[PDB]
Amino acid sequence: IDLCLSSEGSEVILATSSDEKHPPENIIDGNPETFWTTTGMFPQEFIICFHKHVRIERLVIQSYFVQTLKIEKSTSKEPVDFEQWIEKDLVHTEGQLQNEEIVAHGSATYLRFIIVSAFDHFASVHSVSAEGTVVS
Ligand SMILES: [Ca+2]
Ligand SMILES: [Sm+3]
């Protein structure tokens, strides 16, 4: 949500899975029940392109079965030269989605989300939100 919303101009690109029933765009549509899901082996990933420069102060991720999540960021014109930012190990809760809040600051033009491992044969991402401001 927020900065990551497609309604704000952002877009999900270069996803490693493209299931017609669960497209990448589902990660940034502001709907908790639609999601992108993995279809192959790991690591799996996707990149969020802001199509502008932003300064992030908080990230919120809603997912399922994600075991280890790595978040990288770039400030380049193209999705290149990413640098490791956050590497989090999420917990699995029976019958519940994962809701993780990450308070960290960083400038970026793109964010790369890597599902390093999952608690099952697949993992899903319901939403990715970033709180912050756009820089001109
Ligand atoms: Ca969604
Ligand atoms: Sm670890």
Curated annotation (Swiss-Prot):
Known function: Component of the IFT complex B required for sonic hedgehog/SHH signaling. May mediate transport of SHH components: required for the export of SMO and PTCH1 receptors out of the cilium and the accumulation of GLI2 at the ciliary tip in response to activation of the SHH pathway, suggesting it is involved in the dynamic transport of SHH signaling molecules within the cilium. Not required for ciliary assembly. Its role in intraflagellar transport is mainly seen in tissues rich in ciliated cells such as kidney and testis. Essential for male fertility, spermiogenesis and sperm flagella formation.
GO molecular function: metal ion binding
Binding residues annotated for Ca(2+), in chain numbering: 26, 29, 34
SUPFAM superfamilies reported in the protein's UniProt record: Galactose-binding domain-like
Taxonomic lineage: Eukaryota, Metazoa, Chordata, Craniata, Vertebrata
Keywords assigned by UniProt, alphabetized: Calcium, Cell projection, Cilium, Differentiation, Metal-binding, Protein transport, Spermatogenesis, Stress response, Transport
Keyword Calcium carried by entry: yes
Sequence similarity: Belongs to the IFT25 family.
Gene: IFT25
Quaternary structure (record): Component of the IFT complex B, at least composed of IFT20, IFT22, IFT25, IFT27, IFT46, IFT52, TRAF3IP1/IFT54, IFT57, IFT74, IFT80, IFT81, and IFT88. Interacts with IFT27. Interacts with IFT88.
Name by which UniProt lists this protein: Intraflagellar transport protein 25 homolog
Entry GO terms, CC: centrosome; ciliary tip; cilium; intraciliary transport particle B
Tissue specificity of this protein: Detected in placenta.
Subcellular location: Cell projection, Cilium
InterPro entries named in the record: FA58C, Galactose-bd-like_sf, IFT25
Main location: other
Organism the protein comes from: Homo sapiens (Human)
Pfam families associated with the record: F5_F8_type_C
Any single GO BP term: left/right axis specification
